Amino acid sequence: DSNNIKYVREDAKKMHKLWAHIRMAMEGSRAIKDNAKEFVPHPDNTKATTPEGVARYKAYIERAVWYGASANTVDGMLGQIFARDPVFTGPEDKFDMLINDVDGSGLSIHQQARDSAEDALSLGRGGLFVDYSARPYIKFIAAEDILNWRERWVNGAKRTTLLVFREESDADDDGYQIYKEEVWRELRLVDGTYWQRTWRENDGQLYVDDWISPTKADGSQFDEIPFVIFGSKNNDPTIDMPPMRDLVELNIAHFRNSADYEEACFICGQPTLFLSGLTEHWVKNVLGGAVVIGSRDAVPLPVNAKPELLQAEGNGMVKEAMDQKERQMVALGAKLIDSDKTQRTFGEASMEAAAQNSVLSRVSKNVSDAYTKALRWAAMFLGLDEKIEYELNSDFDINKMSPEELAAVISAWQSNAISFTEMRWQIKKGGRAYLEDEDMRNESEQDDPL
């Protein structure tokens, strides 16, 4: 019951380093350059000990350019997933407060879903908490916030019996300074009953609270802890592999190769005369320690003197490795960057569309399940309808819908094959309508001007 509430499950401690790495890779070039020691080894650590070595390493890191493939990958994946908006199924008037302001901050449920999908795509872990205030609130939980979970078997079933997670909040003191006050919720399930504590630590003063048992509208307590841990793979308490690991590693390798290439650019990319076969007498007498290199003047040289404009040549091995890493990130990614040079045949990509959009569909289904479960839990708080759904947009590759597509869908609705709400969802998905279905009905009931 009472123990070290700050304890972190040791495999979460395993995953902290990787999770921080994806966070840094998403943050951008500045974050990577700030901790470049963890990514780009010094070409000579014995130099790195010396102050000249650390200055050289600083200059070496600054000249490098971060490609930013992982951030673009996550952005494009999120954009593809959230074409238009997820649709709500069931009563829409009764659930309006959960939709418009899900957490009470005015942040709509679709935006919270966007954050959850971003987390599940980037570092592949998140959580939803639904608790009573009178109005239920659907929290959002970061991956590093879920810090403990266990599983005994009661009647031989998978039942998460313990779940502790941290919360961050700024104390509302009189002044204008910013603290960081921590709150822990200890969700405990005993003999099929939900229990929870609050560990508010305002002013470091432990206002630990007695165990409480939340009740539904009709009572009967609860049978399951209302906390779904959505992930890249599935809604399991076990940690799932982040989808961005390979892309982040490729980006780091390309960044190192870029550092080498930029150092080469700055040093040996400039042509130089390299006056060979030359004597000090000749220099000090005719050159005078100064060479005019414009086309107006000519320069003399003694017998058997050969000048040689030396400069590093292109298509080197370093840039070849950089090109292959770029192609590899293109190859194992999904709509992360675009190559205007190459062309792709229509119909060839139609067959590979399903394979290319695997992670998108998986995360879409996972988050849809998680949010539907949370909505059902909130309904049971309110004693509302249970058969409700919240599905994220699963039909990917969305564009303006063709005129023949419009004719086909209208013909299909004219037959008893597609419902009116289905047809409106189709026509809105194609960017052909904006008014709600009921409003369109109300306007279209009236007689036409003719």
Binding site: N3, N4, L206
Partner: protein, 320 residues
């Protein structure tokens, strides 16, 4: 026990750390409330509570024919006490560069330090509580010694002496906590019964023949000496006898000190809790503001607050 050598999901994937060898599950219900483990913070380095005292001459004989002179009486107010104990962690040298074993695991270092530290922290709480309880009971005069009589440990005749000491209220003693050697001596004496009050089906009784189960832990605080001078301490506890109360102020930092040829990465932890013994007060002046186990286990650092031994909870028995 568990081996998990068959499948290696990850290198030394939580497979073993020999986390602890002593039984430390002796808190709250485990000790039947005797050693209650709580989580409620309090400030400063103490926790003082005041409660009224028992008026010694409350009832007096009265002579109706001559009331004589009214004896002057007055009422006091005793003070409770709860010292705060500070416990840390020696700097732990994490290997920053992964050391290239058959199991290559750099961050598993901190990952396993977490669990080992949790186990050792609970062990330290239990051991300090037991040592402080022994010291307080000894300072309060709640001790018995059967070392000089016979083998130095009787099967059940030993417990009756503690019952006699604690007096008429002996019913409220629930649990004896003891080292494993007294329990094995108990088994050996029961296994060869002089007065045959044991039968083969009832020779493995863990209780004390009065409804007070013996709870066994290998706490170093309950043993002292070696060979001939070896002594075991068994102490009985009422409800709420030992109060170990956490402040939930765990602090943990990892520093890249370096300063040498290779990088130096360290680990450090800090926490605190409040130790209290029912009916006794830690003498703050005699001891220290942040006492160590040596000062906690030392008598004359504990004062008897309750008027009667029956009020305070705990009796200690020494067996060789």
């Amino acid at each position: 026990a568990l081996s998990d050598l068959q499948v290696f999901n990850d290198w030394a994937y939580k497979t073993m750390s020999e986390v602890l060898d002593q039984q430390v599950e002796l808190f709250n219900g485990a000790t039947r409330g005797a050693i209650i483990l709580r989580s409620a913070g309090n400030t400063g380095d103490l926790s003082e509570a005041a409660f009224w005292a028992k008026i010694q001459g409350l009832v007096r004989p009265r002579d109706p024919y001559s009331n004589a002179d009214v004896a002057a009486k007055d009422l006091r107010q005793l003070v409770d006490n709860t010292i705060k104990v500070a416990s840390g962690t020696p700097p732990i040298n994490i290997p920053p560069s992964m050391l290239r074993w058959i199991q290559k695991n750099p961050q598993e270092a901190g990952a396993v330090i977490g669990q080992q530290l949790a186990g050792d922290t609970m062990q330290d709480m239990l051991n300090n509580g037991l040592a402080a309880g022994k010291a307080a009971f000894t300072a309060g005069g709640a001790v018995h010694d059967i070392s000089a009589a016979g083998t130095g440990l009787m099967t059940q005749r030993a417990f009756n002496a503690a019952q006699r000491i604690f007096g008429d209220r002996s019913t409220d003693i629930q649990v004896w906590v003891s080292h494993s050697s007294p329990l094995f001596d108990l088994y050996d004496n029961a296994l060869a019964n002089a007065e045959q009050l044991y039968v083969f089906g009832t020779v493995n009784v863990r209780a004390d023949a009065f409804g007070r189960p013996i709870i066994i832990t290998d706490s170093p605080a309950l043993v002292s000496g070696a060979a001939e001078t070896l002594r075991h301490s068994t102490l009985g506890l009422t409800t709420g006898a030992i109060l170990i109360e956490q402040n939930q102020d765990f602090d943990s930092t990892v520093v890249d000190g370096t300063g040498k040829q290779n990088i130096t990465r360290q680990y450090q932890a800090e926490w605190s809790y409040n130790l209290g013994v029912n009916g006794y007060a830690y003498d703050i002046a005699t001891g220290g503001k942040a006492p160590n186990p040596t000062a906690l286990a030392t008598a004359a650092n504990w004062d008897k607050i309750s008027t009667s031994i029956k009020d305070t909870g705990g009796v200690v028995l020494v067996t060789k």
